[PDB]
Structures are given as C-alpha cells and as structure tokens.
Write a protein that holds these residues in place. Structure first.
Motif, PDB file in Angstrom:
ATOM      1  N   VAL A  69       0.621  -1.218  -0.088  1.00 36.43           N
ATOM      2  CA  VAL A  69       0.108   0.029   0.064  1.00 36.43           C
ATOM      3  C   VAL A  69       0.895   1.352  -0.034  1.00 36.43           C
ATOM      4  O   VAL A  69       0.736   2.153  -0.979  1.00 36.43           O
ATOM      5  CB  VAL A  69      -1.006  -0.237   0.948  1.00 36.43           C
ATOM      6  N   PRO A  70       1.968   1.322   0.945  1.00 35.55           N
ATOM      7  CA  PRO A  70       2.664   2.648   0.827  1.00 35.55           C
ATOM      8  C   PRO A  70       3.440   2.496  -0.393  1.00 35.55           C
ATOM      9  O   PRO A  70       4.484   3.348  -0.770  1.00 35.55           O
ATOM     10  CB  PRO A  70       3.901   2.555   1.857  1.00 35.55           C
ATOM     11  N   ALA A  71       3.138   1.979  -1.305  1.00 37.40           N
ATOM     12  CA  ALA A  71       3.600   1.696  -2.878  1.00 37.40           C
ATOM     13  C   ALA A  71       2.447   2.114  -3.759  1.00 37.40           C
ATOM     14  O   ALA A  71       2.451   2.893  -4.626  1.00 37.40           O
ATOM     15  CB  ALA A  71       4.127   0.402  -2.780  1.00 37.40           C
ATOM     16  N   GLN A  72       1.380   1.172  -3.939  1.00 38.39           N
ATOM     17  CA  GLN A  72       0.443   1.122  -4.947  1.00 38.39           C
ATOM     18  C   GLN A  72      -0.538  -0.033  -4.888  1.00 38.39           C
ATOM     19  O   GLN A  72      -0.813  -0.443  -5.887  1.00 38.39           O
ATOM     20  CB  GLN A  72       0.691   1.889  -6.421  1.00 38.39           C
ATOM     21  N   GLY A  73      -0.723  -0.630  -3.601  1.00 35.71           N
ATOM     22  CA  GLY A  73      -1.380  -1.788  -3.701  1.00 35.71           C
ATOM     23  C   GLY A  73      -2.843  -1.637  -3.097  1.00 35.71           C
ATOM     24  O   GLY A  73      -3.042  -0.610  -2.354  1.00 35.71           O
ATOM     25  N   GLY A  74      -3.931  -2.625  -3.222  1.00 33.18           N
ATOM     26  CA  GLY A  74      -5.039  -2.343  -2.282  1.00 33.18           C
ATOM     27  C   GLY A  74      -6.069  -3.146  -3.340  1.00 33.18           C
ATOM     28  O   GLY A  74      -6.717  -2.098  -4.161  1.00 33.18           O
ATOM     29  N   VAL A  75      -6.607  -4.064  -2.881  1.00 36.90           N
ATOM     30  CA  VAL A  75      -7.900  -4.732  -3.802  1.00 36.90           C
ATOM     31  C   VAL A  75      -8.981  -4.259  -2.814  1.00 36.90           C
ATOM     32  O   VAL A  75      -9.021  -4.999  -1.692  1.00 36.90           O
ATOM     33  CB  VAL A  75      -7.611  -6.186  -3.653  1.00 36.90           C
ATOM     34  N   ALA A  76      -9.632  -3.559  -3.564  1.00 32.82           N
ATOM     35  CA  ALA A  76     -11.198  -3.412  -2.719  1.00 32.82           C
ATOM     36  C   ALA A  76     -12.247  -4.056  -3.230  1.00 32.82           C
ATOM     37  O   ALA A  76     -12.558  -4.365  -4.459  1.00 32.82           O
ATOM     38  CB  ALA A  76     -11.316  -1.850  -3.065  1.00 32.82           C
ATOM     39  N   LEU A  77     -13.064  -4.607  -2.296  1.00 28.36           N
ATOM     40  CA  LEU A  77     -14.452  -5.255  -2.459  1.00 28.36           C
ATOM     41  C   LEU A  77     -15.420  -5.028  -1.479  1.00 28.36           C
ATOM     42  O   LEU A  77     -15.157  -5.746  -0.330  1.00 28.36           O
ATOM     43  CB  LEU A  77     -13.970  -6.604  -2.563  1.00 28.36           C
ATOM     44  N   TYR A  78     -16.371  -4.259  -1.816  1.00 28.33           N
ATOM     45  CA  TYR A  78     -17.223  -3.971  -0.579  1.00 28.33           C
ATOM     46  C   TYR A  78     -18.657  -4.959  -0.909  1.00 28.33           C
ATOM     47  O   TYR A  78     -19.148  -5.023  -2.121  1.00 28.33           O
ATOM     48  CB  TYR A  78     -17.862  -2.424  -0.846  1.00 28.33           C
ATOM     49  N   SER A  79     -18.914  -5.531  -0.060  1.00 28.39           N
ATOM     50  CA  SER A  79     -20.105  -6.558  -0.119  1.00 28.39           C
ATOM     51  C   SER A  79     -21.225  -6.355   0.740  1.00 28.39           C
ATOM     52  O   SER A  79     -20.933  -5.791   2.070  1.00 28.39           O
ATOM     53  CB  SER A  79     -19.673  -8.120   0.000  1.00 28.39           C
ATOM     54  N   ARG A  80     -22.392  -6.537   0.614  1.00 25.45           N
ATOM     55  CA  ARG A  80     -23.585  -6.283   1.430  1.00 25.45           C
ATOM     56  C   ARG A  80     -23.534  -7.548   2.626  1.00 25.45           C
ATOM     57  O   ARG A  80     -23.634  -7.285   3.808  1.00 25.45           O
ATOM     58  CB  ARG A  80     -24.934  -6.413   0.990  1.00 25.45           C
TER      59      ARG A  80
END
Length: 259
Positions: free
Chosen positions: A62-73
């Motif tokens: 992340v302090p680089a350019q990472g992050g897989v985002a997944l918002y679920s109900r």
C-alpha cells in the motif's frame, strides 16, 4: 443492486471523486478495483461508512500502490489476496470472494501506468489464468471475472487506436486474448454486449482519462458466467472524468452475493 468497477490510486481520492456517493446511491452489490490506500483495518472505520454495506479487502505494498477493494452487502468467507503467501501481501492485485456458490475474482492491474512490467507479471499470471479459465470450466457453479487488464475487443474501441490495445501501437497476443476468451462463447461482454459505444461522441480529452472518456478503455472488464449471460438488465459506462458526480462502470442485473 449492481456491480461497480473503478480503479484508482487512492480510494481516498475515489471518495473525493464522489465514488462513495455512488455506493450509497445504489448500495451496489460488489464494488471491485479502486485501491485500498488505507490499511487493512483502518478502512472499515465508520468514516468509510455509507448507507449500509460491509467491507472486505486486502492490501499489499500500500505505501507503494496496492489494495484490492471489495465492498459487499453480505459477509463473504473466501477472501484471497493472491496465492503466494508473502507475494499476496505484496500483490494486492488478486482477490476473490466466495463460499459455496458464485465465485467472483477481482483483479486490478493497470497497464497504461505500468507497461512492459505488466506484460511480464501478467505473463506468468497468463499461464495460470488460462489454466484458471479451464479450472473454471471444471466447476459446475457460476463465476464473475471483474478485473482491470489490457483487454479490448478492438471492434468497438477502434477509436482509441492509439492505446486501444495497451500502447500507442498494438499487441499481437491481444487478438487471441479476447478471442480465446469470448470466442469461447463462454465469456460475455456485458460491457459492450448490452451497451454499444461504437457510435458515440468524444469530449475534449486530457490525461489517461481520455480513454475512459467514452473514447477508449482504461482497463475495466465485466465478465459473467454462462449462468447470467442472458440476464443483463443494463450497463452504465463512464463518459465523463471522475471528478464530481460522474458514474463508475456499473452493471444492472444480478446483485447481492449469497453464501
């Protein structure tokens, strides 16, 4: 209520772009891509709270350019941030949400901002990916492949001839990439299948936004399994830069993941 897809370099910036306003707008089913930016346990903070939704997702460098985002109900059980132990903690570009039925795979990997580097890391992933597509056939269940790669039918974005494929030029493996997948008559293009952008205008383009500007592709493919192929209610694609009340790549149809 839908599948939203937007890849940014700072989800934080996404919210500043109104994205959050979109997840509350329709309480989307699953929002994939973006970029966690924040930690893996600071994000679910009430600050990111909306109308009413859960948050599942991992971070790598992340302090680089990472992050897989997944918002679920609902509350998914299968949270995978890649299969490489440490690598997963460094990829942040491979995460699927599943339990028993309907396996979705969220893969964010910008190529325009990367280039050759992606063609290498993606290559190895390509071999496995093809094997996965094959590993997906073995499964009798349904699945959704929503990622950000350099896939372009080339028949609907002939306008972005420039990077329509990935770079000012063109890629040879691309033709076989999209063909080998949809020519498979198994992968539907709910993006350009239900909605046609072949005949559209083009607002004054600027940065990489020029692509997304209903003139080219900025890497955003929404793939469904032959289980819903003929069940696509609609597909709203972005035509304006993500700076205000613009709409992200959303798909109307099947929503909410059951486990």
């Amino acid at each position: 209520m839908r599948i939203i897809s937007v890849n940014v370099n700072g989800i934080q910036t996404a919210v500043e772009r109104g994205l959050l306003s979109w997840l509350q707008a329709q309480n989307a089913d699953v929002i994939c891509l973006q970029d966690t930016r924040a930690s893996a346990f600071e994000l679910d903070d009430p600050a990111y709270q909306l109308d009413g939704y859960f948050l599942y997702a991992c971070e790598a460098e992340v302090p680089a350019q990472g992050g897989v985002a997944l918002y679920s109900r609902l509350q998914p059980k299968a949270v995978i941030t890649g299969l490489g132990f440490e690598t997963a903690d460094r990829y942040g570009r491979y995460l699927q949400a599943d339990f028993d039925k309907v396996s979705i795979a969220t893969l964010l990997l910008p190529s325009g901002q990367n280039g050759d580097e992606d063609l290498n890391q993606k290559f190895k992933l390509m071999d496995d990916f093809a094997r996965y597509l094959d590993k997906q056939r073995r499964k009798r269940r349904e699945y959704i492949y929503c990622g950000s790669l350099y896939v372009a039918q080339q028949k609907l974005d002939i306008k972005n001839w420039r990077d329509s494929q990935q770079s000012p030029g063109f890629l040879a493996p691309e033709r076989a990439w999209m063909d080998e997948i949809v020519g498979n008559m198994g992968y539907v293009d709910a993006l350009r299948e239900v909605s046609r952008e072949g005949d559209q205008y083009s607002w004054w383009p600027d940065n990489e936004q020029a692509e997304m500007l209903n003139l080219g592709w900025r890497f955003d493919y929404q793939l469904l399994t032959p289980g819903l192929r003929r069940f696509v209610r609609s597909a709203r694609l972005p035509r304006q830069p993500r700076f205000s009340q613009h709409a992200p790549l959303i798909v109307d149809y099947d929503w909410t993941l059951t486990i």
